[PDB]
Structures are given as structure tokens and as C-alpha cells.
Design a protein around this ligand. Structure first.
Ligand SMILES: N=C(N)c1ccc(C[C@@H](NC(=O)CNS(=O)(=O)c2ccc3ccccc3c2)C(=O)N2CCCCC2)cc1
Lengths: 36, 259
């Protein structure tokens, strides 16, 4: 446990930090590589 | 959120909801950017035509939720606000330009599994992710459809809603509205033709548009729900505060009035 200001971010605990992917995640990724 | 799904638990940890204290009422969503700074749209707080001008003592921030109805002992941190900051150049009397606001809590929150920061955007990630056709994600607990205002409106999500919407290119955004559109907003949602639907609606204002980067596998807030004509009308797009073109500001206040 530690405290601080805004630090690492944007990785959700129960997803990225567990290396799991959520239901809809795959649409965004498929749009990306369908553009540039 | 019009055509969203039920969200997976702990899906958007950054999801804050603004309540008015007494009488209890969901007002807006917001994002947890830090353990004491919640981002929101300016208009949840100040829209003088509908006599809305919300004082610091009028509001309360519920963080860690999933159900809209239920108080959930185990997940949920209710803070209260020390300061409400709204942009000098928030232009309500025309076109909701620079519709952003930033709320300092009274008390830092202890992050948990379920309460955790958004990244704000950087030069490279804005420039890399904000292209037309790229899908981002809007969330919140607001109207599942466009509604005539009755008090018990019936259309209210049980569980937080998620949708994924394409960014649309500026000529097309400009072309869809008589209202003067400016450089610090962007729009998103499907074209007519594209098989698929989605929007935010009333009570999803203030909440994140986030995109996830394939660089380093983190999520960033590209937009804030700001406005639109209706919810999910053909030929109309949802309009979002461009967080990055107000990032130069986004830093400045937390670092002016700092301690
Ligand atoms: N993406 C969506 N479909 C969407 C997005 C946001 C909302 C909530 C939002 N309501 C509206 O935008 C209602 N549509 S509105 O009536 O077209 C509207 C009203 C006033 C305006 C003033 C300045 C600039 C644009 C304006 C747009 C709100 O509470 N506001 C506070 C009052 C001013 C307007 C915004 C609803 C729908």
C-alpha cells in the first residue's frame, strides 16, 4: 500500500493487471488497425 | 447510454457519479483522474438558463459504483468536494465551448480494486489515437433513450452502461448541427448506413470518453460528454470536450493552487 499523486494509471486492476481482457475491448483494437 | 451493454464489474474504475445531496438525485458522471481530482463537464455545475448554479455544498461524489440504485458497502467511497473549478471561457450562452470543470475533493480517496485513475492524454497519444473511425468508449448510468421529462422516467439503467462509438471527422461533425462547433470539441457515433447504433444521453454528461492505447496497454481520457440534440438521432452526432486541447489548462490549475 502506498500513497502519492497521480502515478501509474489507466491499467484497470481486475483486467490489465490480471492480464484479462473485457468483452467489448476487441472492437476498439479492430477499428485501430482498420485505420492508421 | 442508448444501445449500451451491461458493463463488467470494475470495468471503468475512474467512474465517479455526482449526486446532489438533499434531495438525493444523480446529476452527472465524472472521472477519477487522481486520488483527489475528479474531472466533469462544466454544465453539470453551471447553466444559468435552467437556473443551475451548483455550490460546493450542493454536491457529493460517489466513487466505485456499478448498480445505480444500491448503496454497496464493500466497494463504495462517498466523498464531498472542497472546490469546484470551471473554466473562465466556458461559453454557455452560445455553444458550450470549453465545457470542462474540475473538482477537488475534501479528502483524498484510498484506491481499491474498483477505484483507480484514468490517464490524461499526451502529445503522442492524442496525435496517435484521435483519428476518424477509431472507436472509443463512453460509460455512465443515464437514460437508455430519449425521454419526455417525467420524474420517474422508467428508462434508468440498473447497472452502469458501456458503449463503443467511432470518432467522426470534423466536416461531418460541423455539417450535422446549426450550432457553431469549435476546436476544443470533437464528435462520435455512427453514420447512417453503418449497421450499428449508440449514444450517450442525459446523466451521462461529465463522463469519460476513453480510448485504450496498444503501446503500453493503458486507458486515456480523450473526451468528456458535453452535448447533443436528443439521444441517438439519425444524422446527429454526440459531442465531447476535447480534453487535450484543454490539457494545457488541465495541468495549470492543479499546479497553481497546489498546496
Ligand atoms: N450525446 C448526447 N446525445 C447527449 C449529450 C449530452 C446530453 C445532456 C445535455 N443536453 C443537451 O445537450 C440537450 N441538447 S440541446 O437541447 O440540443 C442543447 C441545449 C443547450 C445548448 C447550449 C449550448 C450548446 C449546445 C446546446 C445543446 C445537457 O444536460 N446539457 C446542459 C444544458 C446545456 C446543454 C447540455 C444529452 C444528450
Amino acid at each position: 500500500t502506498f500513497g502519492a499523486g497521480e502515478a501509474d494509471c489507466g491499467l484497470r486492476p481486475l483486467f490489465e493487471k490480471k492480464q484479462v481482457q473485457d468483452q467489448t475491448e476487441k472492437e476498439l483494437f479492430e477499428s485501430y488497425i482498420e485505420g492508421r | 447510454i442508448v444501445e449500451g451493454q451491461d458493463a463488467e464489474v470494475g470495468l471503468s474504475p475512474w467512474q465517479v457519479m455526482l449526486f446532489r445531496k438533499s434531495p438525493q438525485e444523480l446529476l452527472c458522471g465524472a472521472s477519477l483522474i487522481s486520488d483527489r481530482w475528479v474531472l466533469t463537464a462544466a454544465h453539470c455545475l453551471l447553466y444559468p438558463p435552467w437556473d443551475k448554479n451548483f455550490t460546493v455544498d450542493d454536491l457529493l461524489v460517489r466513487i466505485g459504483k456499478h448498480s445505480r440504485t444500491r448503496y454497496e458497502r464493500k466497494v463504495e467511497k462517498i466523498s464531498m468536494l472542497d472546490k469546484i473549478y470551471i473554466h473562465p471561457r466556458y461559453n454557455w450562452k452560445e455553444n458550450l465551448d470549453r465545457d470542462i470543470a474540475l473538482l477537488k475533493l475534501k479528502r483524498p480517496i484510498e484506491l481499491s480494486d474498483y477505484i483507480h485513475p484514468v490517464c490524461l492524454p499526451d502529445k503522442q497519444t492524442a496525435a496517435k489515437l484521435l483519428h476518424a473511425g477509431f472507436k472509443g468508449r463512453v460509460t455512465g448510468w443515464g437514460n437508455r433513450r430519449e425521454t419526455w421529462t417525467t420524474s420517474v422516467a422508467e428508462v434508468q439503467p440498473s447497472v452502469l452502461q458501456v458503449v463503443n462509438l467511432p470518432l467522426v471527422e470534423r466536416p461531418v461533425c460541423k455539417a450535422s448541427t446549426r450550432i457553431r462547433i469549435t476546436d476544443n470539441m470533437f464528435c462520435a457515433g455512427y453514420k447512417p448506413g453503418e449497421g450499428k447504433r449508440g449514444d450517450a444521453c442525459e446523466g451521462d454528461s461529465g463522463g469519460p470518453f476513453v480510448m485504450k492505447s496498444p503501446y503500453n496497454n493503458r486507458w486515456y481520457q480523450m473526451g468528456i460528454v458535453s452535448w447533443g440534440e436528443g439521444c441517438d438521432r439519425d444524422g446527429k452526432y454526440g459531442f465531447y470536450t476535447h480534453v487535450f486541447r484543454l490539457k494545457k489548462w488541465i495541468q495549470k490549475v492543479i499546479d497553481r493552487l497546489g498546496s
